[PDB]
């Protein structure tokens with residue numbers, strides 16, 4: 050699986066993923082499924098950001114903590130939006146709302162509920178994707194056009210197929226915990 054991650058994700062994504070895990074005291078070489086998951090989430094966040102017009106989104110995920118908060122605080126101060134308790138994934142300039150992106154190895158509804166439970170003060174939009182083409186978003190408001198969403202779902206399905214081709218999917222699929 051380590052070889053797979055290094056092989057299928059671009060080096061910027063891999064470096065960020067390794068940094069995040071090390072920050073929690075985890076070794077990418079050992080907790081490989083987690084490593085793959087972090088990379089997948091990052092890729093989706095980047096793809097989602099590229100979906101709209103130029104300038105539509107601000108990427109929060111993948112930034113160091115100080116910078117991420119600086120962006121969030123700056124957005125809140127200027128637009129007047131309420132400040133989130135935890136860092137969200139992106140900011141949508143057009144709809145003027147923060148977005149939390151979730152990618153799950155389980156089922157979209159359960160993950161959406163788990164995400165919803167964490168936000169509580171839910172002014173943040175939630176969008177969840179699975180590796181099997183399903184998606185779930187707050188109020189069925191999907192934000193992006195179908196073509197954009199299709200591109201993400203396809204990339205995710207492809208990752209699943211590749212993992213499966215290497216006999217890595219069964220373990221990966223079962224590594225997500227409530």
Ligand SMILES: Cc1cn([C@H]2C[C@H](O)[C@@H](COP(=O)(O)O)O2)c(=O)[nH]c1=O
Pocket residue numbers: 086087090110138150151152
């Ligand atoms: C906030 C956080 C996320 N993650 C992982 C879970 C996901 O695979 C990825 C993205 O998380 P997020 O969906 O909350 O943005 O980062 C952790 O391992 N520990 C953490 O504390």
Ligand SMILES: [Mn+2]
Pocket residue numbers: 110136137138
């Ligand atoms: Mn995040």
Ligand SMILES: [Mn+2]
Pocket residue numbers: 090138149150151
């Ligand atoms: Mn997320």
